[model samples]
Target chain A: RPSLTLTLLQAREAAMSFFRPSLNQHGLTEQQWRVIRILRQQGEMESYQLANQACILRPSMTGVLARLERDGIVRRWKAPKDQRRVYVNLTEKGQQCFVSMSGDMEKNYQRIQERFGEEKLAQLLELLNELKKIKP
Target chain B: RPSLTLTLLQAREAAMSFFRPSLNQHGLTEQQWRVIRILRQQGEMESYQLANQACILRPSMTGVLARLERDGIVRRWKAPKDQRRVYVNLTEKGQQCFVSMSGDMEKNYQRIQERFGEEKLAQLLELLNELKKIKP
Candidate 1:
């Protein structure tokens, strides 16, 4: 009933609901948002790295990126230093999308903080980040 | 850059890494584990409720449940008192899968607790559960 993974998954579900409406208004799916968000935060990165950072499966990353490319929110290109791999990043339009969502998205984060308490919520995230160290 | 939803999603991704190896060993995917996990905890429930608790989309729930039902891990039936909807739960075999996974799963949970500290992990879960209360 209290499995760690289940709670994490459910918490994510709960957390995402706050943002889903704004994302929908911008016509982006969760995967597309992850791609855009990571690109915005990390700047340009290899497609493989994006797939890892965004948590999209390698097979599915192509489809998600393809849609974003189709929509002009992101563009992919062969790596300048290495022709063997491709890179992805937010397009000008993609930055616009992120900019547009940030205000509403920030408010939702504020709402979560307002309700959950700032210090405790921050502590939760710090602990969650620690979980990444448990690779084994 | 530090959005709540993204962090929660990534945290779930990181948290899940600890359990993914054993789940793969049992030939179960994450979504499948969620389905089986919910049924074992809550007993029988409607398919829609299962999808909500499992954080799966309705359309995708059909596919996940189909595979589980096909694999004999769970069974579905039209509710006796209400014929329009279906309910799902673990089969005897599904219970066996749960019991089988629990031992290995508990070990992984211990590993997380051991590495992350037990009180911190418990507090993290409490904060996560608190997130479900945030409707807006």
Candidate 2:
């Protein structure tokens, strides 16, 4: 049958089951939260550059960033060095929103530790890091 | 910056990049392909049952199945024993589609093996299997 084992997917899903609700309470979809957090953490990045780093398509990033801009969570300005490119940055409101969610995100990480045991969870994280050496 | 590692999500994205062109050439979205494949492989199942197994919500499954039915990829029938439940089955065309994709999928799997050496890929799969065991 269609028995493709989705171990990594399922584990992440289980972790998200806890994280998503907290983000939902604040009316943010997981993707939206990811974008906001990216801008907050990464400072400014050209839209396409952000799309590559975020692993979303340039087309998809267009609409996502548009919505975040509409919501006052982010702003796009013409890159000083590359006038053709628009760089994305979080607004003050975006920073505040991300900071607000930080505590809950920490709790989500803690809960994962409790579920997997600290050592195993660390191992999982490290293995995942090794896997990310994607030869792009 | 946007530096939280979500290996499973990244792997899914990479797999999608590899699979999407072929699926789209046949006019199927990834999720649509997944739904039909899961149903055909698992036998007939109720809407909610499929949703649960597919990690889709009830609302999302409603639309997914509707599209599948409209496209003649699957058929939905009322359950004889449980009128409240709707059972999904693949149409003949879908069965053909599934069979047709197999060779192409295998070729793609070979590409993945080549890109990431077969030994390393096998080791990664084995580690993922171990993680799955811990979850169950």
Candidate 3:
């Protein structure tokens, strides 16, 4: 029997293979790209929330963000009201880097889109969402 | 526009969430589970080959297999013809662990299958495979 979870990981790896070249060119790991993508859209988010969304473990998140910060692609700031909490934001250079990588990534995505009909890709995502909704 | 790679990542994290509790109970990381599952089926494989199939990085695979060996779940041996190259095989303990976790894992899989429908799940895998085959 085919394993659903393993298939998910395999598909994820294959889908990621198309984009990884672009991510590598921009000096980003898969986790780093996820973090950057999330921060780019959300503008700012807490460390824990970013880690949660990125599916990066808390300890690993700290390291990924630290590297992002060191590379001048991201910055961390303390919350004024709660000194204990930290938030992350993408920098101007980070946005530039994203824009730089976005074209190549989209082209690769289009390659998949053209080969696998857009309708099927949409349904695949829908099935994945429905799969996620499964609870028991 | 929804990013296909990010969606794949999100869907993977979601699918994996169901199986992780069982993995934790058996003291296995996702990578470790992939390694064990591969070995259980394939019997023996080269270190780099296992890493490639399991999607674990070469550096990380070394650590994962070391822990597995330390736990008596796997063993490594040099080939007679080529003493420099090594291969890994699952120990009895590894197969026992695979059998132990297989039940719970299947139930969780059934939850997904029942809720998502077997037909849809199969198609999802088909779609994923098609997505993987996209070349350009």
Candidate 4:
């Protein structure tokens, strides 16, 4: 009875509708913002780890990070132990952009939470995390 | 504490991982499957309507539908009364493909349900519906 894929997509679309305007205001795609947010929270990490943490596929992350690096919002460096291994981190400008964006982003989330109610939102989050633990 | 976008994307990725192999075996992408599934359930619809129902952006649907048409999985026609109006539906071949794929698709969903628990999945679905009801 439950269509997991469609429901997740619709709900994500609903949540993103609130954030996308602000994301656009700052000229960041959702994927770009995800990279910035994760880097801000977790510090420098290898590209694969960032892709995993960001919930972006590794293949798509290549283009997203490349665009972020091009915009000077993020920077990449070789891991000393393995030159082929690339680590990505937010540039100072990226951190500042994230800081600026977080205020409006938090407010938008607060609005969504207020409309959704705290208990239901928490329950959905729990369910999502539970689902995420399932291996394919 | 939870990142809504990240959680949603991760949950979706988990679900897609289950279905993607089956979809690939049938020579379809997830978006292509979604279009076929919606068309199978709702019959023929306008491109914009399909886009809305499929939770894909209108502009993106153009390319998705074009590919489906190119692959002969779907066909498009102009509404006689409204020459400018375009509608799309599955070809006979597309319908056959869907019928063939649906059996295994249902089995995968059943497996997901068994692993995730029936009640939890239903709860997640209800929560997602509620979220979708929110206006941006």
Q: Highest lDDT: which candidate?
A: 4
- Model 2, A9-127: lDDT tens digits are 65556566767779888889777876776677678888887886666756777889989999999989997787898888998988988889888888877766676567766555555
Show how many residue pairs clash in every candidate, following the order shown: 0, 0, 0, 0
lDDT of 2 at A99: 89
lDDT of 4 by residue, B2-62 (tens): 5897788889888888898898787777888888988888899988888988888677798
Per-residue accuracy of model 4 over A15-38 as CA lDDT, tens digit each: 888999999887889988888889
TM-score winner between 1 and 3, please give it.
1
Candidate 1 clashes between residue pairs 3 or more apart in a chain or in different chains: none
RMSD vs true structure, all candidates: 1.5, 3.5, 2.1, 1.8
What C-alpha lDDT does candidate 3 achieve relative to the native structure? 0.83
Off by over 4 Å in 3: none
Given candidate 4, what's the lDDT at residue A81? 94
The TM-score each candidate achieves on chain A is 0.94, 0.88, 0.91, 0.91
CAPRI category for model 4: medium
TM-score of each: 0.95, 0.80, 0.90, 0.93
Residue-by-residue lDDT tens digits, candidate 3, A42-62: 889999989987778888898
Q: How would you order the candidates by DockQ, starting with the best? A: 4, 1, 3, 2
Error of 3 at B37 (Å): 0.9
- Reference-based lDDT, each prediction: 0.85, 0.70, 0.83, 0.87
Give the winner by TM-score. Answer: 1
Ranking of models by lDDT: 4, 1, 3, 2
Candidate 2 residues B20-44, lDDT tens each?
Answer: 6777777787677768767767888
